[PDB]
Amino acid sequence: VQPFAAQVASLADRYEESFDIGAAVEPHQLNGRQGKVLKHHYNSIVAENAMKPISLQPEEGVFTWDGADAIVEFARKNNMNLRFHTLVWHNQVPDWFFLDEEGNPMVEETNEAKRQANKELLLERLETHIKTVVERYKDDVTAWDVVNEVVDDGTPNERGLRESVWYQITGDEYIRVAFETARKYAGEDAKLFINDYNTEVTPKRDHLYNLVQDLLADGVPIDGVGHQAHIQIDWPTIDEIRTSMEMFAGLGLDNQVTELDVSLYGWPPRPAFPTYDAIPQERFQAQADRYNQLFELYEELDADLSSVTFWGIADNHTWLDDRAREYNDGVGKDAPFVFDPNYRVKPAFWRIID
């Protein structure tokens, strides 16, 4: 029988000379077995949802801080670092941002002068959201996801920027405003990140590379690149991950791995195992080999990698299950972490603690 997580050596202790070991959390996960695992294994946390724009400012000028504050207070009490996720995203963002003075979607406006007025209004709203949040949390946050997922996976425009509402309304200016505002209110020492997934693979990797070089050349304050690392057992390759981190380090940017999970499935994730107990032990072994290689690499890159955060704690809670159910008629279970649903260690744990 595998031991419980609190009975084995701490991942944070294991990696103390290399990088933080973090987890994404909800306020309800700060106690019980999850809270115990958190305190034992991790020295950094991030909010899975509580610090997203819709979670903090759900209506204009109506700020709701309780969940985010609970996470901050836990980080303080437990001497953990804290990543802020996220100031800007095109999901989990309230629609009121993108409505004009008449209450209609800014994207539908056809008068270009009115479009420019809408751009200014949205950028003002964005400045206010960032100022208010940053002023509250600036003494607690150790890395800010200033913008999230602003780069496209394909090439819909020359710069490979995601054509979300932010882009449709403001072009790239929301990205500049976000970084400049975060710097202004968080201070000169605050570590400002651009976060994205599929940062290991092109064309996205190069769109992001070009975007950061463009920002930097314009004096936009950017300190680091967040690699979500929603990955699989076989993809992307170790050398793909390596090359991406080296590219960003070459620009003088920090790397963080921000949302790590190693799914048991390819894309699309079907067919999925219908329950956790249906998952064959061999698949956990393949995951363990993957995890060993990933953490060997992260250690190799530790002069340019400051923090490695998993997108959850243990296999009882993961957004990958929603994904599995979506592609398998409501039934399916993934298992992306080194701790199982009862907080026992998995084969992967043993291969990254050694």
Q: Which does 292 bind (CB under 5 to 8 A by kind): Mg ion, Cl ion, Na ion, none?
A: Mg ion
By CB under 5 A, the residues from 285 to 314 that bind Na ion are 302, 306
Contact assessment for residue 64 and residue 94, using Cβ atoms and an 8 Å cutoff: no
Instruction: Using the structure block, give the residue that is written with the tokens 């993961």.
Output: 318
Residue 105: CB minimum distance to Mg ion, A: 51
Shorter beta-carbon distance to Mg ion: residue 137 or 310: 310
Task: Rule CB under 5 A: say whether 290 interacts with Mg ion.
Answer: no
Contact assessment for residue 133 and residue 87, using Cβ atoms and an 8 Å cutoff: yes
Residues lying near Cl ion in the complex (CB under 5 A):
164
Question: 116 in helix, strand or coil?
Answer: helix
Residue with nearest beta carbon to Na ion: 302
Among 8, 11, 15, 19, binds Na ion (CB under 5 A): 19
Instruction: Using the structure block, give the residue that is written with the tokens 């009121």.
Output: 96
Task: List the catalytic residue out of 102, 259, 296, 300.
Answer: 259
Measured in whole angstroms, how far is the alpha carbon of residue 322 from the centre of its chain? Answer: 17
Stated as kind and residue range, the H or E segment containing 194 is strand 192-196
Burial class (CB in 10 A: 0-12, 13-18, 19+), 113: exposed
Quick one: which segment of 14-22, 283-291, 322-330, 337-345 binds Na ion (CB under 5 A)?
14-22
Residue 162: CB minimum distance to Cl ion, A: 5
Residue 15: CB minimum distance to Na ion, A: 9
**Sign of torsion over alpha carbons 40, 77, 80, 26:** positive
Q: Which does 40 bind (CB under 5 to 8 A by kind): Mg ion, Cl ion, Na ion, none?
A: none
The binding site for Mg(2+) consists of: 18, 292, 302, 305, 351, 354
Residue with nearest beta carbon to Mg ion: 292
Give CA–CA dist 12/75, Å, rounded: 15
Residue 301: CB minimum distance to Na ion, A: 8
Task: Rule CB under 5 A: say whether 293 interacts with Mg ion.
Answer: no
By CB under 5 A, the residues from 252 to 271 that bind Na ion are none
Q: Which does 351 bind (CB under 5 to 8 A by kind): Na ion, Mg ion, Cl ion, none?
A: Mg ion
- Nearest Cα neighbor of 14 from 287, 343, 238, 349 is 349
C-alpha distances out from residue 151 to 34, 156, 167, 194, 333, Å: 33, 10, 10, 10, 29
C-alpha distances out from residue 281 to 54, 149, 277, 338, 348, Å: 40, 34, 9, 14, 12
Task: Rule CB under 5 A: say whether 49 interacts with Mg ion.
Answer: no
Q: Which does 164 bind (CB under 5 to 8 A by kind): Na ion, Mg ion, Cl ion, none?
A: Cl ion
Task: Rule CB under 5 A: say whether 193 interacts with Na ion.
Answer: no
Contact assessment for residue 237 and residue 294, using Cβ atoms and an 8 Å cutoff: no
- Nearest Cα neighbor of 191 from 221, 148, 211 is 221
Q: Is 259 a catalytic residue?
A: yes
Residue 18: CB minimum distance to Na ion, A: 5
Q: Which does 302 bind (CB under 5 to 8 A by kind): Na ion, Cl ion, Mg ion, none?
A: Na ion
Task: Rule CB under 5 A: say whether 153 interacts with Na ion.
Answer: no
* Binding residues vs Na ion (CB under 5 A): 19, 302, 306
Just list the catalytic residues: 259
Q: Which parts of this chain interact with Mg ion (CB under 5 A)?
A: 292, 351, 354
